[PDB]
């Protein structure tokens, strides 16, 4: 009966690109939600299927932690029922979501003076992601009626594109590390309690 490892997913040094978003499963542990309410640093903390404060005295079968980096102006898309480029082609929550979305500004870490180009978003996809899908393909997107045959050009576009995170950007285009906790409830016996 040892701790839940939220310190290694929240306090982690390197963060995924949103299109290739990371996922840490959380099983068989006792969860100190204290580190969430006592943080000051979070810019977002909306919960969905649960009451945000009662997290302590609650029990779950499995908890999942998803981490990635987006713009400030995009955090409003990491929430059930939202649409748009991130929600449609990078990371969608079910409508029946039960969990908490957490974010915080990371301009000081994830920006660089010439722009940090490590962090990527998918700009093109033929279909909206289904919820919790992850698409890491790098095929050339075919906007035209003729095949691209492995050559980018007119109507033939690489599907990923980079944020140009410079520290001088407006808040809208500053980076924000995001953590999405999924509280899974299965008929099987619980393993994540307080």
């Amino acid at each position, epitope marked *: 009966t040892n701790l839940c490892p939220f310190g290694e997913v929240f306090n982690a040094t390197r963060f995924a690109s949103v299109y290739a978003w990371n996922r840490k499963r959380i099983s068989n542990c006792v969860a100190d939600y204290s580190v969430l309410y006592n943080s000051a640093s979070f810019s977002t903390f909306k919960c969905y299927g649960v009451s945000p404060t009662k997290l302590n005295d609650l029990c779950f079968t499995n908890v999942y932690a998803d981490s990635f980096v987006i713009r400030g102006d995009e955090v409003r898309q990491i929430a059930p029922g939202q649409t748009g480029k991130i929600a449609d082609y990078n990371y969608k929550l079910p409508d029946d979501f039960t969990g908490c979305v957490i974010a915080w500004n990371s301009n000081n870490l994830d920006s660089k003076v010439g722009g940090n180009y490590n962090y990527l978003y998918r700009l093109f996809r033929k279909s909206n992601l289904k919820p919790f899908e992850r698409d890491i393909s790098t095929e050339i997107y075919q906007a035209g009626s003729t095949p691209c045959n492995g050559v980018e050009g007119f109507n033939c576009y690489f599907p990923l594109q980079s944020y140009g995170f410079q520290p001088t950007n407006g808040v809208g*285009y500053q980076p924000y590390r995001v953590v999405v906790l999924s509280f899974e409830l299965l008929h099987a016996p619980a393993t994540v309690c307080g």
Partner: antibody
Amino acid sequence: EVQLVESGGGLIQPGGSLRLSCAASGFIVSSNYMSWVRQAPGKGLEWVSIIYSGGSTYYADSVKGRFTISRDNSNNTLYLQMNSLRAEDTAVYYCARALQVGATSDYFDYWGQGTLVTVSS
Amino acid sequence: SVLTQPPSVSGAPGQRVTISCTGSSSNIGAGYDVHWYQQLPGTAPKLLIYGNSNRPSGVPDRFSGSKSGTSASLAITGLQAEDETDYYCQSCDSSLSVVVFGGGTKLTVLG
């Protein structure tokens, strides 16, 4: 190789309805950010609606609830159903492919010729 | 008109005219890039510059662009009379998540 040809515009009573069509060739509409931008006679440009490659739609606040952007794979066509037309809806309606490929914001890199909508009694 | 451009600018052939586009912290100051379109009256707009400064294929190196803080600028060097048309800038605004256009600029070629 590539073309956008709009039609459907005319003269309509205020309150009436109309469906604009934008036939494409070269572009597969269903695979593109497609958009309607309009321009009142003698006046500037105003975006109207967009539809995302995966199907999401958005609208200028002036037309929200009145206008509907859809597309057809069979006809390879973009449509704009305009209901409850007001006088201020009078303009030339353009069909455009939208891209964000070198930028942080979307732009319209290929445009059709425009179809004229005149709402008056 | 969200973005703001001069109603008109003038130049003689061979000169260098610039057309400004000033926005705010909800668009250009938010980090949404600026784009520039040319429209001859009676015709359809044509993408001239995208992403602040890139030229689509088919646009002569005469046209260039730039963006600083909340303003952006279209430079036309070696002005020719075929450039006697209307110019529009365009960005996106985050206050109202809607793409916004400048008001337009009519370029008159003199001399």
